[PDB]
Design a binder for this molecule. Structure first.
Ligand SMILES: Nc1ncnc2c1ncn2[C@@H]1O[C@H](COP(=O)(O)OP(=O)(O)OP(=O)(O)O)[C@@H](O)[C@H]1O
Ligand SMILES: Nc1ncnc2c1ncn2[C@@H]1O[C@H](COP(=O)(O)OP(=O)(O)OP(=O)(O)O)[C@@H](O)[C@H]1O
Ligand SMILES: Nc1ncnc2c1ncn2[C@@H]1O[C@H](COP(=O)(O)O)[C@@H](O)[C@H]1O
Ligand SMILES: [Mg+2]
Ligand SMILES: [Mg+2]
Lengths: 73, 102, 304
């Protein structure tokens, strides 16, 4: 009764998946201050002077709100 | 508020990143499931409200040298008093990041 | 007039219906430095920010320009007496300094509550910012204001089975304030205007000349401009100099007369997108003020 062999999948989870499905890496909101699957995703500004700015857009029924949290470290 | 970045970025080894988020999760008493080597579902019991919050971690390659950890909140199903799912999501993230990054 | 197209409309629409399709909201953790917090309002172009207490895991209040004005007034007076605490206060510590023994909880409203209930909560709590909070998720969805509510009313009742009172004047409906009007002069130092803001709790001040004719207006909004500068110390300058720094040009102060119909005033206010009209006489001398609160108070206790 022979031994058995394992052919193991490997890679596919070699390198992590590349980004762009349609999800933006950077969002410029200069302005002198409509997008799909970026809902629920975390965004941040660079930490400046010991403050964290966290942000995400969520949906309540048909309404969308982008929430910003200003939080010390 | 000009420039927004999706998640956080790192040039640490992918395997290091994922291992360190996992140690961070366990240290924090969050609970987790490994969907993929680069994809984690996590769940948290709120030590004040006793409510539960769920989110996703996904690691992406953005350069040959650079990766991007991405956090996604997962949805459910006169004074306010305890709870806000959106704010609790930010705190989970903040906690996760502080307890494993930089 | 009685019972009114407005009162029924308000009772039959949800707060949800006034929320725009997309909005931004700024939230401050209560451990945040007061100074950074007011700089964030300016940066984001926003008037008010909910406060989140991390220890308690809930919203506990609001941060508005009024708090900013209160803090600048206390800082200014404290500096003269060599006390410099104020600027290193966290929101937490300033709230503990003023919300002392006397408690004022956060007032908010469900997205499923009548617009009537929203108007009644703003009047009764003497408030200009009502956060709409989802009781299922705990999320603040939006911050509701008089301006928004009035605009919505003007638009979605546009159609006239018109109540008689729409064609009646401010005079005869007695809407607005016609006595003890807080005002400043061309030369009035900014800090003097602050003291007036604090003592009278009033959102704007008509700027007048020597015969008391209105030539400008100095608002609370014109006060977070002081959070643009990297100094804070420029409060001794005149009100005229302070207003020169305004964003956009300025087609004069928006005025009205005592004898204008309510309908005419609502339309002017709605399309000018401003919090109040300065009531004026034949010669531009100020006779009073008509604010959004005045109108919404009128419309809800049934016109005039
Ligand atoms: N929804 C609320 N619940 C509890 N307290 C509030 C609420 N909104 C404001 N406050 C507090 O009550 C006071 C009233 O301020 P208000 O909201 O009128 O400021 P403001 O809206 O910027 O003033 P104005 O409309 O004149 O520009 C402030 O100290 C503020 O911190
Ligand atoms: N009657 C008026 N005529 C001309 N300009 C005005 C008048 N009232 C306010 N302004 C100006 O308009 C700008 C915005 O003031 P206003 O208080 O209306 O804005 P706001 O705080 O967003 O209003 P609200 O608190 O109702 O939402 C200020 O710079 C102020 O000087
Ligand atoms: N400068 C002012 N002097 C006196 N009363 C005012 C002034 N500004 C507003 N009011 C009145 O005070 C109330 C609050 O208005 P507002 O603060 O503008 O919402 C309203 O009844 C106004 O008519
Ligand atoms: Mg204000
Ligand atoms: Mg406004």
């Amino acid at each position: 009764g022979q031994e058995m062999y394992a052919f193991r999948s490997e890679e596919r989870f070699k390198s992590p998946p590349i980004l762009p499905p349609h999800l933006l890496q950077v969002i410029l909101n200069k302005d002198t201050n409509p997008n799909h699957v970026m809902l629920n995703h975390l965004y941040a500004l660079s930490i400046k002077d010991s403050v964290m700015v966290l942000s995400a857009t969520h949906r309540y029924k048909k309404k969308y709100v982008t929430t910003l949290l200003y939080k010390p470290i | 508020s000009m420039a927004w970045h999706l998640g956080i970025r790192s040039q640490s080894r992918p395997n290091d990143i994922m291992a360190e988020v996992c140690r961070a999760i366990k240290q924090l008493d969050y609970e987790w499931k490994v969907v993929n080597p680069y994809y984690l579902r996590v769940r948290r019991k709120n030590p004040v409200t006793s409510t539960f919050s769920k989110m996703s971690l996904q690691l992406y390659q953005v350069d040959s040298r650079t990766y991007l950890l991405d956090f996604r909140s997962i949805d459910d199903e006169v004074a306010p008093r305890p709870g806000s799912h959106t704010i609790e999501f930010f705190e989970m993230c903040a906690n996760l990041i502080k307890i494993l990054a930089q | 007039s009685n019972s009114s197209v407005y009162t029924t409309f308000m009772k039959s629409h949800r707060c949800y219906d006034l929320i725009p399709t997309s909005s931004k909201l700024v939230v401050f953790d209560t451990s945040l430095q007061v100074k950074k917090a007011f700089f964030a309002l300016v940066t984001n172009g926003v008037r008010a920010a909910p406060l989140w207490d991390s220890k308690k895991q809930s919203f506990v209040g609001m941060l508005t320009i009024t708090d900013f004005i209160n803090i600048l007034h206390r800082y200014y007076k404290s500096a003269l007496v060599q006390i410099y605490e104020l600027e290193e206060h966290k929101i937490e510590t300033w709230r503990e300094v003023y919300l002392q023994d006397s408690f004022k909880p956060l007032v908010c409203i469900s997205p499923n509550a009548s617009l009537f209930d929203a108007v009644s909560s703003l009047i009764r709590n003497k408030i200009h910012r009502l956060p709409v909070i989802d009781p299922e998720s705990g999320n603040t969805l939006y911050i509701l204001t008089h301006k928004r509510i009035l605009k919505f009313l003007k638009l979605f009742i546009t159609e006239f089975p018109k109540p008689e009172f729409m064609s009646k004047s401010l005079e005869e409906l007695q809407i607005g304030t016609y006595a003890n009007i807080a005002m400043v002069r061309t030369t009035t130092p900014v800090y003097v205007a602050l003291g007036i803001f604090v003592q009278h709790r009033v959102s704007a001040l008509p700027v007048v000349d020597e015969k008391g004719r209105v030539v400008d207006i100095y608002s609370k909004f014109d006060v977070i401009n002081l959070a643009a500068e990297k100094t804070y110390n420029n409060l001794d300058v005149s009100v005229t100099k302070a207003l020169q720094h305004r964003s956009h040009y300025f087609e004069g102060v928006l005025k009205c007369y005592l004898h204008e119909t309510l309908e005419a005033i609502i339309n002017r206010l709605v399309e000018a997108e401003v919090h109040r009209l300065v009531v004026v006489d034949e010669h531009d001398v100020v006779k009073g003020i008509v604010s959004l609160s005045d109108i919404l108070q009128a419309l809800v206790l049934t016109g005039g």
